[PDB]
């Protein structure tokens with residue numbers, strides 16, 4: 001499906017999942033959210049714009065926050081992803097997140113993921129990734145990164161809510177900010193703001209990708 | 216109080232009479248594209 005790309009980095013894949021082990025040879029994987037799974041990943045400027053000012057309140061402020069990052073640019077690195085999450089699932093459980101990126105450049109990259117409540121940072125996960133040469137480009141993979149305990153707790157609490165409108169109500173004040181940076185130069189390669197609702201549709205998880213603009 | 220209180224976040228929706236969280240503008244009331252609220 002539709003993915004996310006600046007001039008220097010393309011995120012081809014992103015998925016958060018629960019993997020359950022029935023027995024040593026049998027595993028069941030449930031995808032909560034996914035980009036580049038059901039169909040081959042592609043990227044083009046054929047997607048709509050969102051005024052970033054409409055979402056500043058939902059993400060960290062001050063130096064290093066979303067406004068600061070956006071103003072520093074480049075403008076083409078900033079995206080808003082709306083997820084409709086599939087919550088229909090559930091000792092032998094593994095909650096994980098996997099992502100893959102491609103670049104023309106051989107870099108050392110840092111991926112910061114901040115989980116936020118009411119626009120305030122709750123937890124940050126920071127990962128450093130080195131390049132691998134692949135078919136005329138450089139590939140970066142964050143493979144089966146364990147979901148933090150806060151997120152596991154959050155998912156558990158969501159599923160224990162008796163009504164779906166309640167889940168959506170909670171989700172309106174839950175956000176994730178992902179910032180992928182060149183470690184040495186501190187250039188913003190990708191900055192992705194994630195917003196959530198619960199999926200109701202029979203096919204499962206869905207997403208829409210928007211460009212963040214100044215207006 | 217603490218804005219990042221996980222229990223308080225869920226209590227706000229489960230037990231609205233005892234809700235103690237920041238007051239916010241719902242997303243559906245904001246200047247956002249139609250595609251934001253309608254899945255593909």
Ligand SMILES: *C(=O)CCCCCCCCCCCCC
Nearest residue numbers: 016032085097113125147148196
């Ligand atoms: C580290 O723990 C942060 C990894 C990024 C989180 C992936 C998104 C999790 C989506 C799960 C669905 C629950 C939210 C509706």
